[PDB]
Amino acid sequence: MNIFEMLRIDEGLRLKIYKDTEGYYTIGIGHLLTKSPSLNAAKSELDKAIGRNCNGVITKDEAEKLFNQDVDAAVRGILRNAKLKPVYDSLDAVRRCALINMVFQMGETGVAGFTDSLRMLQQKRWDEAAVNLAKSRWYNQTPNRAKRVITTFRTGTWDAYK
């Protein structure tokens, strides 16, 4: 199991503009297009992003291209983040995937907001961190996906995804 396969399981793949769980316009593998309520604004962002007139639909390849960019951006953002970098450096490879997953979903700033959870992960207090992570809007809104990520941090294995 690797980061790409983990996120593909958590986000799914759709080739036509859809609304994410928060009601925002998205496409492919969790690629947010716009927070705007306008389908048209979504369509324009989508075309800007692909370099073609897509009229709200893309190919598998295009979706995978966007996915490669987004995972790269997520990893590079963690490494530039003064609060995220130290945690990431302190983790094992599986747990590292779990933090990349949160960042892809919530953005760098959102994850950096989990102060106490971050401190506990860096200290390797697995069980404590899992309990604190669950006390969040994130957990209440997408509980199945959150539990999966949380189990990953808690155990250090890919069990939740197997």
Least separation in angstroms between residue 31's CB and Cl ion is: 18
Strand, helix or coil at 108?
A: helix
Instruction: Tell me whether residue 72 is one of the annotated catalytic residues.
Output: no
Instruction: Tell me whether residue 20 is one of the annotated catalytic residues.
Output: yes
Is 148 or 154 the residue whose CB approaches Cl ion more closely?
Answer: 148
Task: Tell me: does residue 22 bind Cl ion (CB under 5 A).
Answer: no
Task: Tell me: does residue 135 bind Cl ion (CB under 5 A).
Answer: yes
Least separation in angstroms between residue 43's CB and Cl ion is: 27
Q: For residue 32, what are its two tokens?
A: 């947010």
User: CA-CA distance, 6 to 37, in Å (whole number)?
Assistant: 29
Task: Point out which span in 45-53, 103-111, 134-142, 148-156 binds Cl ion (CB under 5 A).
Answer: 134-142
Numbered residues of the known binding site for substrate: 32, 104, 117, 132
Task: Tell me: does residue 142 bind Cl ion (CB under 5 A).
Answer: yes
Q: What is the dihedral of CA 96, 62, 18, 138, to 10 degrees?
A: 10
Is 15 or 134 the residue whose CB approaches Cl ion more closely?
Answer: 134
- Strands 25-28 and 31-34 turn out to be antiparallel
Residue 18 bridge partners (DSSP): 26
Fill in the DSSP letter of residue 57: B
* Residues of this chain that bind Cl ion (CB under 5 A): 135, 142, 144-145
